[PDB]
C-alpha cells in the first residue's frame with residue numbers, strides 16, 4: 001500500500017485521498033458516478049461495458065513527444081535532429097523538463113489520486129515495474145487493462161522502475177517561449193525514469209510511451225523489442241505478425257484455433273517471445289460480430305470503449321466514425337478465451353509475417369520472402385492509407401515506417417533489424433509478406449480470405465506450394481493455395497489489363513527505392529538494395 005509521503009517524493013503535495021490499485025468493481029462504480037462531468041464521465045452501454053470520450057485527442061500526438069537530452073540519453077538515443085531519417089525523438093532540455101514536471105505535480109496536488117502499479121513485460125528479469133498516477137478514473141482503468149496486473153504477493157515487494165504521471169487536465173502556457181510544438185506535452189526523462197503527460201487525454205500515450213521505453217532498454221541487452229502480435233498453435237509453433245496501425249495484427253492473431261500470446265508489443269529473448277502487456281486494445285470502427293466474434297464478445301463489463309457512438313437507448317453504433325475512425329476498446333487479455341496463461345509467453349517464433357495494407361493495389365496477398373528481402377522490407381516498413389478523406393475520387397497515400405513502428409523506436413532502425421535477424425536465424429524462422437490491403441478491385445481483401453492465407457502459411461501449405469516470381473518486386477508468389485481464390489494470388493489478375501498493374505507497380509517501386517536511400521550509408525544497407533524492387 002501507498003501513503004501520502006511516497007507521493008511527496010515525486011513532488012506531489014497535499015494528497016487528499018489515494019486509490020491504490022483499484023479493483024474492476026471500484027473502477028466501474030467510479031466511472032458511473034453521476035456527479036462526474038466532462039471527459040471523466042463514462043456511460044454504460046447495453047453490452048455492459050462503459051464508454052468514455054478522450055476529448056480533443058482521439059489518437060497519438062507525435063509532434064508533442066519529447067525526450068530529455070542529458071548524459072544518460074545523449075549518445076544512445078536516435079535523435080530527430082541528429083540521426084538520419086525522420087523520427088519524433090525531439091530533444092528536451094533538463095530545465096524545460098522541470099518546468100513541465102512542476103506543471104504536472106501541481107496539477108495532481110491536493111487531488112484524490114488513482115495509483116496503479118503494474119508490470120511492462122511478462123518476464124521478471126527484463127520487466128519494468130511502472131507506477132501510474134492519475135486523477136481520472138478511466139485512465140487508471142486503461143492502465144489496469146493494458147499492463148500486467150501484479151498479484152498481492154508481487155505488490156508486497158513492489159518498487160517502481162518507471163513513473164508515469166498523467167496531468168491531462170493541465171497544459172503548458174509557456175510553450176511558445178520554450179520552443180515546443182504546443183501547449184500539450186508527452187515528455188520522457190530517462191535519468192529520472194519518468195513520463196509526463198499534459199493536455200492530451202488519450203490513453204494510448206501511456207501504452208506507447210512505455211513501449212518506446214522497452215524499445216530503448218531491450219535491444220541494448222540483445223533482446224528483440226517488436227511491434228507485433230503473436231500466437232502459438234497446439235504443436236508449440238509460434239507465429240509473430242508485424243505491421244503498422246490498422247493492418248490486421250489484432251484481427252488476425254485473434255484466431256480461435258491458436259493460443260493468443262499478445263496483440264501488439266512483444267520481446268524476443270533467449271527463451272522466446274513474450275508479451276509486454278496484460279490486455280488488448282482493439283479497433284472497433286465498423287466492427288462486425290460475424291467477422292470478429294471473439295473481439296466482439298470481449299466487449300462486456302470491465303472492457304473500456306473509447307470514442308464510440310452510444311445511442312440514447314445504450315446501443316453502440318460501431319459504424320459511426322464522425323468523431324474518429326480510431327474508435328477503440330481495451331480489455332483484460334482474459335476476455336479472449338483461447339490465450340496462453342498464466343504467463344503470456346511461448347517459445348521461439350518460426351513464422352514471421354509482415355502485414356501491409358497496400359492502398360496501391362500492387363502487392364500480392366502473400367509472398368515468401370528471402371533473407372535479404374526480409375531485412376529490406378523490415379527496414380522499409382511500408383503501408384498505404386487510402387486517404388484523401390475519400391470524398392475526392394482516389395488517394396492511396398503511402399507510409400514508410402522503419403520496423404513497422406517508427407513512431408516508437410528509441411534507437412536507430414538497424415539496431416532493431418539486427419537483433420531480430422539473429423533471433424530469426426537461431427530459430428530457423430521464415431518470413432512472409434502479406435497484403436491485407438487492396439488489389440485492382442478497389443475493395444479491400446476480405447478478412448475471410450486473409451485468414452485463409454494465414455492458415456496456409458501456418459500449416460505449411462504455402463511452403464510446399466509451387467511459386468513463380470512477380471516482376472519488379474521479385475516476390476515468390478504461390479501458384480495456388482487451399483482455401484483461397486486463385487485469381488487473387490497474382491495481383492495483375494484483379495486488373496482489366498496487367499498494363500494497369502504495371503503503371504502503379506513502377507510508381508510504388510520508385511517510392512521504395514527513393515525511401516531506402518537513407519540506409520545506403522553502410523555496406524549493409526547498400527548490399528540490401530539488390531533485395532529491393534528494380535525497374
Ligand SMILES: Nc1ncnc2c1ncn2[C@@H]1O[C@H](COP(=O)(O)OP(=O)(O)O)[C@@H](O)[C@H]1O
Nearest residue numbers: 245246247248249250251283436445446447450
Ligand atoms: N483483410 C483484412 N485483414 C485484416 N484486417 C482487415 C481486413 N479487412 C478489413 N480489416 C480491418 O482493418 C483493421 C485492422 O486493425 P487491427 O488488427 O486492429 O490493426 P493493428 O492491430 O495492426 O493496428 C480492423 O479494423 C479490421 O476490421
Ligand SMILES: [Mg+2]
Nearest residue numbers: 249250264281
Ligand atoms: Mg491492435
